[PDB]
Structures are given as structure tokens and as C-alpha cells.
């Protein structure tokens, strides 16, 4: 547990100097919402150097039960027109999506 009064997470460490966490979902609604965010951001905001996002996370084995939150937080850096096109499919506004993204991060990490 990283923050006082927070929840337990799985912290990992990398040979390039990176630090990351994997946190569990507690409800089906959060999981479904983040799954739809990832699905819609895989198409309308593709990786910069020509890679397929689902194929990259399936490099040696297919992905199973993980949502890429580094792709999901790239929503806050898109242009307002595409932010609206993405948000209006989730039946939501961009500020609500931003608040929902910040909630799960501040629940576990900083």
C-alpha cells in the first residue's frame, strides 16, 4: 500500500528505470467503462510509430484481463474535437471522463 489510507496494489520495477502498478477493479461498472474507453482509444488515437496497441500488449502471449491505463490517460492530451467524439460514445462529457480517470489513480497511487 503506497499512500496512507489507500488500497493495496502490485508494484513492479523495470530495468530501464520505470516504476508502475497493477491495481484490481472492485466493480463491473468501472471495468466495463474503462474497457470501452480503451476500445475507443485504440482506434481513434493509434500509436505514433505505426504499432497496433492490442498486438503490442500481446507480444509473446495474448493479453488477459488487463486494461492499459497509459493508453487511457492519453485521452486528456487529445484535441477537444476528438475528445468530444470519444466522450459522446460513452454517454458522457470530457470533464466526467477526466474525473473518472483521476479517481482510480488517486485511490491507489499518487
Amino acid at each position: 500500500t503506497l499512500i496512507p489510507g489507500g488500497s493495496e496494489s502490485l508494484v513492479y520495477t523495470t530495468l530501464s528505470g520505470g516504476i508502475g502498478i497493477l491495481v484490481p477493479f472492485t466493480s463491473h461498472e468501472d471495468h466495463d467503462f474503462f474497457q470501452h474507453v480503451e476500445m475507443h482509444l485504440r482506434s481513434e488515437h493509434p500509436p505514433l510509430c505505426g504499432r497496433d496497441h492490442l498486438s503490442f500488449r500481446s507480444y509473446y502471449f495474448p493479453v488477459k484481463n488487463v486494461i492499459d491505463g497509459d493508453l487511457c490517460e492519453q485521452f486528456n492530451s487529445m484535441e477537444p474535437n476528438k475528445q468530444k467524439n470519444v466522450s459522446e460514445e460513452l454517454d458522457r462529457t470530457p470533464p466526467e471522463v477526466s474525473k473518472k480517470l483521476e479517481d482510480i489513480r488517486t485511490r491507489y497511487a499518487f
Partner: protein, 144 residues
């Protein structure tokens, strides 16, 4: 949308895969292929491995349509189930004494190799050095 309905059609596909009629097995293989490519990234690997256990014995089939459907189903399972399982199914036949088994298994292996050549790096089994040649990959044995 099919991710919620794979458990319901599995016994029917079992029965059809056990059916003597060529169309029954060919069409069941087509169903397996479409189901595999339909659910991908949704965690349905259990039923798909179960169904592969019934699809695989048909690799020694001479009828062209049946073997075409079997190859399609195998290439769909390569995506839905992963290349590691496919390599595990091909390993013991790659070097069989009979030329028929070797032909079939090398066709399947080449199909697995052309797609996802990079993932196979992490899946190859260990092969020991002989007197003449070195076969161990030593870098992967490093321990920081």
C-alpha cells in the same frame, strides 16, 4: 457479442466434431474459426482449448475442403489462444519418422511461424549442446 454464448454451443460442436459426416466436421471447424476470431482479448481460452482438443485429430484428413476448414480454424486459434499452445501441439510431430506426419506438421508450423515470428522467441524449448555444436541460448539464463 458472442463472448456470452460460447459455453452454450460447446457440447453441440463436440457432437458435430465427433460426427462421421465430412460436412459436420468441416462446418464445425468453420464455426470454431469464426468463434475464435470473434472473441479475442475477452478471456475465453478454456472452451477454445477444449475445442482444439477435438479439432486437432482431423489434421490427417485427405479431403481438401475438410483440411481447408481445419487450417482456417487452426489459424483462428493461433490468434485467440496464442502461438505457444500451437507450438506445443506441433513439437512432437515436427521430427516424426513418417513423412506424412512431417509434411502436415511442417505446414502447420510454417503457418504459425509466418504470423507472430517474434513471440516464438519466448516459447522455444531448451535443446542441449552436443559434442560438435552449441545450442543453449546463454543470455536468457542470466540472473540479475
Amino acid at each position: 457479442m458472442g463472448k456470452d454464448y460460447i459455453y452454450a454451443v460447446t457440447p453441440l460442436l463436440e457432437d458435430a466434431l465427433m460426427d462421421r459426416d465430412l460436412v459436420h466436421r468441416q462446418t464445425a471447424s468453420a464455426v470454431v474459426q469464426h468463434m475464435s476470431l470473434g472473441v479475442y482479448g475477452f478471456g475465453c481460452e478454456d472452451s477454445l482449448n477444449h475445442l482444439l482438443n477435438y479439432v486437432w485429430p482431423n489434421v490427417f484428413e485427405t479431403s481438401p475442403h475438410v483440411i481447408q476448414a481445419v487450417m482456417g480454424a487452426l489459424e483462428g486459434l493461433r490468434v485467440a489462444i496464442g502461438p505457444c499452445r500451437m507450438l506445443q501441439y506441433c513439437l512432437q510431430g515436427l521430427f516424426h519418422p513418417a513423412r506424412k506426419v512431417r509434411d502436415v506438421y511442417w505446414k502447420i508450423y510454417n503457418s504459425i511461424y509466418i504470423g507472430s515470428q517474434d513471440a516464438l522467441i519466448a516459447h522455444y524449448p531448451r535443446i542441449y549442446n552436443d559434442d560438435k555444436n552449441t545450442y543453449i541460448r546463454y543470455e536468457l539464463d542470466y540472473i540479475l
